[PDB]
Amino acid sequence: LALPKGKPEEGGFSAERLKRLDDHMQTMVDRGQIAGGVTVLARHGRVVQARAFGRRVLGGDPMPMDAIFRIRSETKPVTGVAMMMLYEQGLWRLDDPVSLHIPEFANLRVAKGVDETGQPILTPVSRSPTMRELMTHTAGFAYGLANDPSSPADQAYYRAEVLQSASLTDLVQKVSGLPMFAEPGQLWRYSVAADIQGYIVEKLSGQSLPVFMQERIFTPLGMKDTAFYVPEEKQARLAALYDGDPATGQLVPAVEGAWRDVSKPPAAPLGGGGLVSTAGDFARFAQMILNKGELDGVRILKPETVALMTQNHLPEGFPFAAGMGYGIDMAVAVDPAASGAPVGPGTVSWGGSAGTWFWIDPANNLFFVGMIQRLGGVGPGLDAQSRTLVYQALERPPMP
Ligand code: NA
Numbered sequence: 297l298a299l300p301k302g303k304p305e306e307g308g309f310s311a312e313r314l315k316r317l318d319d320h321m322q323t324m325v326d327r328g329q330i331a332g333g334v335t336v337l338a339r340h341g342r343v344v345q346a347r348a349f350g351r352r353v354l355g356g357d358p359m360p361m362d363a364i365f366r367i368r369s370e371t372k373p374v375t376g377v378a379m380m381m382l383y384e385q386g387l388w389r390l391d392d393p394v395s396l397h398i399p400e401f402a403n404l405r406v407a408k409g410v411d412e413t414g415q416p417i418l419t420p421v422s423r424s425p426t427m428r429e430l431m432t433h434t435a436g437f438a439y440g441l442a443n444d445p446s447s448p449a450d451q452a453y454y455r456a457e458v459l460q461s462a463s464l465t466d467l468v469q470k471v472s473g474l475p476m477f478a479e480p481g482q483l484w485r486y487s488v489a490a491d492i493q494g495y496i497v498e499k500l501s502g503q504s505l506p507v508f509m510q511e512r513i514f515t516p517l518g519m520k521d522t523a524f525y526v527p528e529e530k531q532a533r534l535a536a537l538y539d540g541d542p543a544t545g546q547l548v549p550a551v552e553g554a555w556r557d558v559s560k561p562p563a564a565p566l567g568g569g570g571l572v573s574t575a576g577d578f579a580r581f582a583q584m585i586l587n588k589g590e591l592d593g594v595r596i597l598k599p600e601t602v603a604l605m606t607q608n609h610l611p612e613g614f615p616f617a618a619g620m621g622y623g624i625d626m627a628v629a630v631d632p633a634a635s636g637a638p639v640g641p642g643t644v645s646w647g648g649s650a651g652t653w654f655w656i657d658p659a660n661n662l663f664f665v666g667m668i669q670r671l672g673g674v675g676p677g678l679d680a681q682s683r684t685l686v687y688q689a690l691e692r693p694p695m696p
């Protein structure tokens with residue numbers, strides 16, 4: 297699994313109590329909640345638990361350890377590293393207006409409310425969002441997958457097919473002429489911001505996003521299976537994506553259509569959602585963050601840059617639990633005691649709509665990668681469950 301192996305007690309875990317995570321994963325397969333999955337738990341640079349469960353596809357063969365997964369929104373922290381590499385080269389600053397780097401954003405308008413004909417009343421945006429706000433989902437851009445007529449801006453991005461564009465130039469031109477959810481800096485709201493960050497990687501680097509991520513991240517870290525598509529020779533390791541249908545609530549093939557397909561290179565590669573990866577590949581990415589920018593003698597970020605990314609960038613003012621802030625393209629647990637969560641302060645995490653999850657806990661020097669392909673609801677449960685089955689198994693000193 298191209299990362300050092302160890303007994304649980306070398307990570308500081310009870311073997312007996314870690315079996316409870318193994319057991320919960322098997323109970324989730326047995327009771328038909330998921331076809332299968334892969335989990336990786338590492339502490340002090342050594343993998344202490346690495347296990348495959350159930351099946352790749354529902355009828356067929358067992359889940360291999362190097363199964364390939366749609367990681368969806370969990371691509372966002374990878375785009376953040378790409379963006380912070382361009383930061384170290386001086387090509388953009390957090391205080392820059394996004395419109396310095398995307399001039400069409402000069403024409404941004406905001407939905408104030410609706411008139412009697414159910415049309416948004418549109419005002420020119422007060423000012424450009426900042427790059428800091430783009431990296432934090434506080435730029436006021438709308439969400440791209442909600443046909444919600446109570447949020448005009450989201451309705452318009454959905455109707456404009458923002459995420460199913462012909463190119464990243466297209467995506468960004470559409471966004472520039474479409475209503476914003478809100479003025480920049482007003483609230484945190486999950487948005488297309490990482491998909492826009494992707495255009496900025498391309499504009500600033502002179503390379504397409506998939507080339508820039510390959511040369512600067514995946515090849516240097518040995519993330520051999522991480523890409524915006526699954527080449528023909530690897531299609532046999534792809535986990536299949538299952539849903540729960542109404543009535544019987546049992547494992548059904550999922551339908552998503554065209555633009556989500558991972559068999560061909562995508563027209564508009566999504567910095568917020570397009571990557572496939574393996575548990576092993578994502579584990580290497582997680583350890584590079586714990587090492588503050590370096591893996592196996594390969595340095596891709598300065599430690600100051602990793603430290604910046606993994607702090608809360610949300611203003612004092614600030615919809616997602618108590619003690620919970622947000623860094624550069626990641627959630628951060630500023631004060632997890634406030635929500636009774638077991639992770640250490642400074643823990644960074646995220647997850648994907650296909651039910652993959654991870655967290656990196658610098659204070660406890662550990663991380664956890666959870667891989668399934670199950671739409672809506674159950675994936676987040678496994679995340680919270682894993683943490684419990686993980687932090688109950690963890691034995692540390694009282695030394696403060
Ligand atoms: Na580790």
Ligand code: NA
Pocket residue numbers: 403404405406471472473474475476
């Ligand atoms: Na606009």
Ligand code: NA
Pocket residue numbers: 639640641642643644656657658659660
């Ligand atoms: Na932490």
Ligand code: NA
Pocket residue numbers: 370578652653654665666667
């Ligand atoms: Na994961």
